[PDB]
Amino acid sequence: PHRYRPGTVALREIRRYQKSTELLIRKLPFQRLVREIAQDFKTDLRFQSSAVMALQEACEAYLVGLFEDTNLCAIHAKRVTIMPKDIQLARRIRGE
Amino acid sequence: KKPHRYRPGTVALREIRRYQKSTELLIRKLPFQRLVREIAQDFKTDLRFQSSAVMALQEACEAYLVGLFEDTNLCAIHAKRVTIMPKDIQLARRIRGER
Amino acid sequence: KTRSSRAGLQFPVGRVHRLLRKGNYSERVGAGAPVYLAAVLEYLTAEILELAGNAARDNKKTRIIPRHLQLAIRNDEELNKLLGRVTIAQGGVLPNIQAVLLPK
Amino acid sequence: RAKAKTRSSRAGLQFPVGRVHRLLRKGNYSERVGAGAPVYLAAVLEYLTAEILELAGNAARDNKKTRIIPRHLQLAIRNDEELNKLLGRVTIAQGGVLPNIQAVLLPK
Amino acid sequence: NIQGITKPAIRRLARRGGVKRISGLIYEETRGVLKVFLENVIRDAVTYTEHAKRKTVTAMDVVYALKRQGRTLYGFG
Amino acid sequence: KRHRKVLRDNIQGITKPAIRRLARRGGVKRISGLIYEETRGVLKVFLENVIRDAVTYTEHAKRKTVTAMDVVYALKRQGRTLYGFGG
Amino acid sequence: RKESYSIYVYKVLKQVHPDTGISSKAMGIMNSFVNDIFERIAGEASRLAHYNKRSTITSREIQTAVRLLLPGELAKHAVSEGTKAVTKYTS
Amino acid sequence: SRKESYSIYVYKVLKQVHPDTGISSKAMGIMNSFVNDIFERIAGEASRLAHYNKRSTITSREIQTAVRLLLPGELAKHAVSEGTKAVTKYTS
DNA sequence: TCAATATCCACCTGCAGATTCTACCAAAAGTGTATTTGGAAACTGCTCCATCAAAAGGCATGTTCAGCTGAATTCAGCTGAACATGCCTTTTGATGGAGCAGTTTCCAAATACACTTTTGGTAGAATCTGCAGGTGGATATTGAT
DNA sequence: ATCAATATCCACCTGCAGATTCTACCAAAAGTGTATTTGGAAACTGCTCCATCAAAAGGCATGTTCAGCTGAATTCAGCTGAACATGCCTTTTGATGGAGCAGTTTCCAAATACACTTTTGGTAGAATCTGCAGGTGGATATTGAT
Ligand SMILES: [Cl-]
Ligand SMILES: [Cl-]
Ligand SMILES: [Cl-]
Ligand SMILES: [Cl-]
Ligand SMILES: [Mn+2]
Ligand SMILES: [Mn+2]
Ligand SMILES: [Mn+2]
Ligand SMILES: [Mn+2]
Ligand SMILES: [Mn+2]
Ligand SMILES: [Mn+2]
Ligand SMILES: [Mn+2]
Ligand SMILES: [Mn+2]
Ligand SMILES: [Mn+2]
Ligand SMILES: [Mn+2]
């Protein structure tokens, strides 16, 4: 039976998702998360649809960029695998 | 009685403690001033400078370089090195959004 | 006769002038300021639309979409610099894989 | 005419309400400015000044100095998480840095 | 609800970020990071909402929060 | 009408030991030989960018003297706010 | 009512690519763009006027603001267009 | 040649919090820079707030919201407490 | 354990820098009139929120193994430590005068205001572009030599 | 270091749903015709600071030597993370009400603007005042040794 070697399909996915623009997190759980977080700041809140979509576009753009920097940190350490310490270095240098 | 010698790194660490304890500018005043005037003159000729303007520029520059060296150091350590290298600087600046 | 027409512009000189007057920028606004500003905004719009139109045509699309704007902007060094801290919704990213990740 | 009372005294403040009001008027922030706005602003500026001076004074005494210098301001700000956050992109002239050596650099 | 941001979703985000290989510990880390981000933005957004004396967070509330955090977003004005 | 000796190659005034001292304050224990030149390039770029903006302000004000405030404004608009040089 | 730059963006688009259209989302991004650059330039011009104790924002402040905000060639071409437009307008 | 600054008010506050402590000229310059900086941030955010909401007036409400946007956590809470107290005392 | 060296820690005083004193006056405060605005009340649609339901496709799980990461190990050459030499920075002060500020005057350019003309926003109609799937060829990968 | 077999990618296709472009009505915004005011440029001029140089003392930069230790290179395997198959449940998609908010509009009481007049807190410069910088010297702590 056929099996691709470790890495081939990963690369295929990179090309695939860098080619496209669709949101990568599921709508409903993101919305649920947003409402949960919002509740600890202000009671009785409602949300415009486009407000939640705005938050998702912003969040996903942020995470993708962070993963770019994280990847650079992993490669810097002569690895190809990203690890929490890569994220933490990236966020420290960003001033986060 | 062979002369005294500190091992590589001991004096470096001592210097770190020394210069992190203090606040004096670490670049020589007059050469920095010449640098500022040369660069400014390549934008507009015959410019003059308030004294405090050059001093402001030096404070800004040294603060910038010190912070950059902090991030660079973190990049070196990340790569399991103790020696900072140009690629460390370049990574730090790439992640900062300077490059 | 409109001010935009006299200035050879498509962007609205009158509107830009009003937005300057009411934006709490200064107590007064010169007559040339909204003309200059409108001209600059129109220029930048034209540059971006030029490149984005190109990207749209490569994609054999007759309509410019956010993706084409992102491609146009990030592939242009100076536009990318100008919009360095800006997120284009539904823009995605530039195709880019670090060489070390590739086979061989 | 009634005896002069200043707005700072009326507000219980040390920072100048009148001056802050004038700066708001001439800074082109809005066409109109409420009576409470410069009072509120002056109070906030005064408070933040007080927090930084409190911590900086503390550092000065820890260093057995009676006079606050830029170093003390830097120590006060960087050793306080919220002030450090507020002034995250700010350079304190002649402030230096916090003593900090990465553990991996120390001898074994 | 943070666990609703699933592993394959985070993987897709990382792929778009150009990542080829991913440690198992990334996912939880990512979640923490995401939460912090969201919190900050939303905290500001709601502040705007409250100033306008509204009970509905608008797209503009979010846009202003993002802008003032140096993360300007185009497309939702 | 007695101008100074023309300024040249002054970036080299940012010496190796000076860069070492800056790195020490930054917590650096060991330094590759190639760092110093690298640092100079970085510093020059930074300086150029600040001074350019500063001079722009000076030129807008129709002055021939760069002021501390010109520099402060340049730095502020470059997201590197500097305290201590107002007034 | 609710203002945008949409019709002007479309006119420019028709100038540079006569047979090209634009999606709603893309137009929203263009509007965001124009408002953003407007704010940047107007704000810098405001500060320029304030620093120099002037109560009037003139084309000179706009031009200087453009020089401060725009990189290189974009700055030069923008300055050229603004100057040209003001010159055509004045007569 | 008359140049205004916040020096005397900073000094009065200093004497409030540390009665036997002084301050160097350089440090005072940093404090003046600080006050002007925060002034600009708060006033600017308030201006934006009033604009967003189609109000021509910056009131203590705009100041307060700006303070909440700009300041971290407890610092924000404490500042809001001081401003509110000051405005209510002023009103009386 | 020592010798060698650096850093720590009081103690000292004089003078450069900080604080206080003084008194004029710029700007804040009092007062009165003019002009703008905030909100309470009364509305109207229109987005959301709540709820229900089916079903699709995305995710969770378990298995197998390929290959990546980390540890261990080896070496040569670079960088840190130390030292002499002497340059050029630092410090303090002179000497001109370039160029900021400060004043005064007066138009070119801006605001103000009353009223008309033109334009841009909006929602539905009319066009016509993408996209949803499905094909076939291009391209790329895998395992075997 | 090529080959045969295989899987996925990528144009290209059509038909038609729906997203965009076109249209027309109409408040609102820009334009316009005049009148009137004013910000700031020009021309001065006084007088701070700024440019440049000078001397001298010694702090610091430079060049050298050389050996410790680091970075770089290499080896190897254990265990992690990728790929793939399977079947369950969460999300997606669609329908239906209706209650909650935005979003508007009207009108006075309340708030703010702004000019005039008057007063005092803030400033600049002078006079006092006084930390702490260096200079001294000894205790203590760390370092590297053969
Ligand atoms: Cl890790
Ligand atoms: Cl390197
Ligand atoms: Cl108020
Ligand atoms: Cl003008
Ligand atoms: Mn030159
Ligand atoms: Mn007077
Ligand atoms: Mn009139
Ligand atoms: Mn029309
Ligand atoms: Mn398809
Ligand atoms: Mn005048
Ligand atoms: Mn090593
Ligand atoms: Mn194995
Ligand atoms: Mn008095
Ligand atoms: Mn001392």
Short mmCIF file of all heavy atoms in Angstrom, two decimals, chain F residues 43-63:
data_model
loop_
_atom_site.label_atom_id
_atom_site.label_comp_id
_atom_site.label_asym_id
_atom_site.label_seq_id
_atom_site.Cartn_x
_atom_site.Cartn_y
_atom_site.Cartn_z
N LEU F 43 24.34 50.14 13.53
CA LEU F 43 24.27 51.42 14.20
C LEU F 43 24.10 52.51 13.16
O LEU F 43 23.22 53.37 13.31
CB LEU F 43 25.53 51.68 15.03
CG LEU F 43 25.70 53.10 15.57
CD1 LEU F 43 24.57 53.44 16.52
CD2 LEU F 43 27.03 53.26 16.26
N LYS F 44 24.85 52.40 12.07
CA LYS F 44 24.81 53.48 11.09
C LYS F 44 23.40 53.60 10.54
O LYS F 44 22.84 54.70 10.54
CB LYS F 44 25.80 53.23 9.95
CG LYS F 44 25.89 54.38 8.96
CD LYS F 44 27.34 54.62 8.61
CE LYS F 44 27.54 55.90 7.83
NZ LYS F 44 26.90 55.85 6.50
N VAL F 45 22.78 52.46 10.26
CA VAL F 45 21.43 52.51 9.69
C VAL F 45 20.53 53.21 10.67
O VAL F 45 19.88 54.20 10.31
CB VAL F 45 20.86 51.11 9.39
CG1 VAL F 45 19.39 51.20 8.99
CG2 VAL F 45 21.66 50.42 8.30
N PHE F 46 20.61 52.81 11.94
CA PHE F 46 19.75 53.39 12.95
C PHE F 46 19.96 54.89 12.97
O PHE F 46 19.00 55.65 12.76
CB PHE F 46 20.06 52.80 14.34
CG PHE F 46 19.20 53.35 15.45
CD1 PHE F 46 17.93 52.85 15.68
CD2 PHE F 46 19.68 54.35 16.29
CE1 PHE F 46 17.14 53.35 16.71
CE2 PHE F 46 18.90 54.85 17.32
CZ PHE F 46 17.63 54.35 17.52
N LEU F 47 21.22 55.29 13.02
CA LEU F 47 21.51 56.71 13.16
C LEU F 47 20.97 57.44 11.96
O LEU F 47 20.23 58.43 12.13
CB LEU F 47 23.01 56.96 13.30
CG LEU F 47 23.43 57.45 14.68
CD1 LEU F 47 24.91 57.75 14.71
CD2 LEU F 47 22.61 58.68 15.06
N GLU F 48 21.22 56.89 10.78
CA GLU F 48 20.78 57.55 9.56
C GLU F 48 19.30 57.85 9.66
O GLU F 48 18.90 59.01 9.61
CB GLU F 48 21.06 56.68 8.33
CG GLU F 48 22.43 56.87 7.69
CD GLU F 48 22.78 55.75 6.74
OE1 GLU F 48 21.97 54.81 6.56
OE2 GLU F 48 23.91 55.79 6.20
N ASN F 49 18.53 56.83 10.02
CA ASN F 49 17.08 56.95 10.05
C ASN F 49 16.64 58.02 11.02
O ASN F 49 15.76 58.82 10.71
CB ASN F 49 16.43 55.62 10.39
CG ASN F 49 16.56 54.62 9.26
OD1 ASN F 49 16.90 54.99 8.14
ND2 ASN F 49 16.31 53.35 9.55
N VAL F 50 17.25 58.04 12.20
CA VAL F 50 16.84 59.04 13.16
C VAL F 50 17.21 60.41 12.63
O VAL F 50 16.34 61.28 12.48
CB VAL F 50 17.50 58.84 14.52
CG1 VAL F 50 17.07 59.94 15.48
CG2 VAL F 50 17.12 57.48 15.09
N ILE F 51 18.46 60.56 12.18
CA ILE F 51 18.94 61.90 11.85
C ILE F 51 18.18 62.45 10.66
O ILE F 51 17.81 63.63 10.65
CB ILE F 51 20.45 61.89 11.57
CG1 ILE F 51 21.22 61.78 12.89
CG2 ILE F 51 20.87 63.17 10.83
CD1 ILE F 51 22.69 61.51 12.72
N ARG F 52 17.87 61.58 9.71
CA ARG F 52 17.09 61.99 8.55
C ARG F 52 15.82 62.68 9.00
O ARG F 52 15.62 63.88 8.72
CB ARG F 52 16.74 60.77 7.68
CG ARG F 52 15.96 61.11 6.42
CD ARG F 52 15.64 59.88 5.57
NE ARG F 52 16.72 58.90 5.49
CZ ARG F 52 16.65 57.66 5.95
NH1 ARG F 52 15.54 57.22 6.52
NH2 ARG F 52 17.69 56.84 5.83
N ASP F 53 15.06 62.02 9.87
CA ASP F 53 13.80 62.60 10.31
C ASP F 53 14.07 63.86 11.07
O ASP F 53 13.40 64.87 10.86
CB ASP F 53 13.00 61.62 11.17
CG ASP F 53 12.32 60.54 10.35
OD1 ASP F 53 12.46 60.59 9.11
OD2 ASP F 53 11.65 59.67 10.94
N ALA F 54 15.10 63.84 11.92
CA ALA F 54 15.39 65.02 12.72
C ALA F 54 15.64 66.21 11.81
O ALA F 54 15.01 67.27 11.97
CB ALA F 54 16.59 64.77 13.63
N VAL F 55 16.43 65.97 10.77
CA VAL F 55 16.82 67.07 9.90
C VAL F 55 15.60 67.56 9.16
O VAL F 55 15.43 68.77 8.96
CB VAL F 55 17.91 66.65 8.91
CG1 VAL F 55 18.07 67.70 7.82
CG2 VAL F 55 19.23 66.42 9.62
N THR F 56 14.71 66.63 8.84
CA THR F 56 13.48 67.01 8.17
C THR F 56 12.71 68.01 9.01
O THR F 56 12.35 69.08 8.51
CB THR F 56 12.58 65.79 7.89
OG1 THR F 56 13.21 64.93 6.93
CG2 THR F 56 11.24 66.25 7.35
N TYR F 57 12.59 67.73 10.30
CA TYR F 57 11.90 68.67 11.17
C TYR F 57 12.63 70.00 11.16
O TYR F 57 12.00 71.04 10.95
CB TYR F 57 11.80 68.13 12.60
CG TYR F 57 10.76 67.05 12.80
CD1 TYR F 57 11.14 65.73 13.04
CD2 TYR F 57 9.41 67.35 12.77
CE1 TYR F 57 10.19 64.75 13.23
CE2 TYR F 57 8.45 66.37 12.95
CZ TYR F 57 8.85 65.08 13.18
OH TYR F 57 7.89 64.10 13.36
N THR F 58 13.95 69.94 11.24
CA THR F 58 14.76 71.16 11.25
C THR F 58 14.49 71.96 9.99
O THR F 58 14.36 73.18 10.04
CB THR F 58 16.27 70.87 11.36
OG1 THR F 58 16.52 70.00 12.47
CG2 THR F 58 17.05 72.16 11.53
N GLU F 59 14.38 71.26 8.87
CA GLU F 59 14.20 71.94 7.60
C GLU F 59 12.80 72.52 7.53
O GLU F 59 12.62 73.61 6.99
CB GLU F 59 14.46 71.00 6.44
CG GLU F 59 15.92 70.85 6.11
CD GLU F 59 16.19 69.66 5.24
OE1 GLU F 59 15.24 68.90 4.98
OE2 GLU F 59 17.34 69.51 4.81
N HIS F 60 11.82 71.81 8.07
CA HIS F 60 10.45 72.32 8.06
C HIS F 60 10.35 73.62 8.85
O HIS F 60 9.60 74.53 8.47
CB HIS F 60 9.46 71.30 8.62
CG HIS F 60 8.04 71.77 8.57
ND1 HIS F 60 7.31 71.81 7.40
CD2 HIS F 60 7.21 72.24 9.54
CE1 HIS F 60 6.10 72.28 7.64
NE2 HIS F 60 6.01 72.54 8.93
N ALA F 61 11.11 73.71 9.94
CA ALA F 61 11.08 74.87 10.82
C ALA F 61 11.90 76.02 10.25
O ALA F 61 12.00 77.08 10.87
CB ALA F 61 11.58 74.49 12.21
N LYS F 62 12.48 75.79 9.08
CA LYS F 62 13.38 76.74 8.45
C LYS F 62 14.51 77.15 9.39
O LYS F 62 14.83 78.34 9.52
CB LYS F 62 12.61 77.97 7.96
CG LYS F 62 11.50 77.65 6.98
CD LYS F 62 10.96 78.91 6.33
CE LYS F 62 9.85 78.59 5.35
NZ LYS F 62 9.11 79.80 4.90
N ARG F 63 15.11 76.16 10.05
CA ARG F 63 16.25 76.40 10.93
C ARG F 63 17.50 75.76 10.34
O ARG F 63 17.42 74.90 9.47
CB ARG F 63 16.00 75.84 12.33
CG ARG F 63 15.00 76.60 13.18
CD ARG F 63 15.00 76.08 14.61
NE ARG F 63 13.95 75.09 14.86
CZ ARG F 63 14.14 73.78 14.83
NH1 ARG F 63 15.34 73.28 14.55
NH2 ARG F 63 13.13 72.96 15.07
#
